[PDB]
Design a protein around this ligand. Structure first.
Ligand SMILES: Cc1nn(C2CC2)c2c1[C@@H](c1ccc(Cl)cc1)N(c1cc(C)c(=O)n(C)c1)C2=O
Length: 126
C-alpha cells in the first residue's frame, strides 16, 4: 500500500537536447492536455495511500503521469521527442492495464489520448 519514489526527473549524467520538437511537446501538447477537464487524475503520480489502492504499484511497474512529464520537459531531461511520446503512451497504457474497460477513468484517458494523438500528428520537422 506504500507509494514508490516518483520517476526520475533529473540526472546530470543523462545527455540532454533542447529541440523544436521537445519545445512543441511542452507549449502545445502538454499545455493543451493539462487544461482539459479530464486531466486532473493524470496531473500527478497515482497516490496509492490516499486512494487506498494497495495493488496499483504491484500491477504498474513503469508509473508515469503528466506532472512527471511536465517536470522532464521544464528541466530539459529528454534526448528526443520519441522519449517524451513514450512517457505519454506509458501513462495511457498504464490506465488501461490497471482499470477495467468501460471504467470512468478509462473514458477520461481515451479522450486525452485522442487529443494527444492529434497533436502528435502535427509534430514539426526537426
Ligand atoms: C478520486 C481520486 N482522486 N485522485 C487524486 C487526483 C486527486 C485520484 C482519484 C482517482 C480517480 C480519478 C478519476 C476517476 Cl473517474 C476514478 C478514480 N485517481 C486515479 C488516476 C488514475 C490515472 C488511475 O489509474 N486510478 C486508478 C486512479 C486519482 O489520481
Amino acid at each position: 500500500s506504500m507509494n514508490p519514489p516518483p520517476p526520475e526527473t533529473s540526472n546530470p549524467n543523462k545527455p540532454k537536447r533542447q529541440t523544436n520538437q521537445l519545445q512543441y511537446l511542452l507549449r502545445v501538447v502538454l499545455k493543451t492536455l493539462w487544461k482539459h477537464q479530464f486531466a486532473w487524475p493524470f496531473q500527478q503520480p497515482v497516490d496509492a495511500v490516499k486512494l487506498n489502492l494497495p495493488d496499483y504499484y504491484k500491477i504498474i511497474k513503469t508509473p508515469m503521469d503528466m506532472g512527471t512529464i511536465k517536470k522532464r520537459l521544464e528541466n530539459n531531461y529528454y534526448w528526443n521527442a520519441q522519449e517524451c511520446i513514450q512517457d505519454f503512451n506509458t501513462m495511457f497504457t498504464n490506465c488501461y492495464i490497471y482499470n477495467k474497460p468501460g471504467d470512468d477513468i478509462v473514458l477520461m484517458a481515451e479522450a486525452l489520448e485522442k487529443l494527444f494523438l492529434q497533436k502528435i500528428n502535427e509534430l514539426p520537422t526537426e
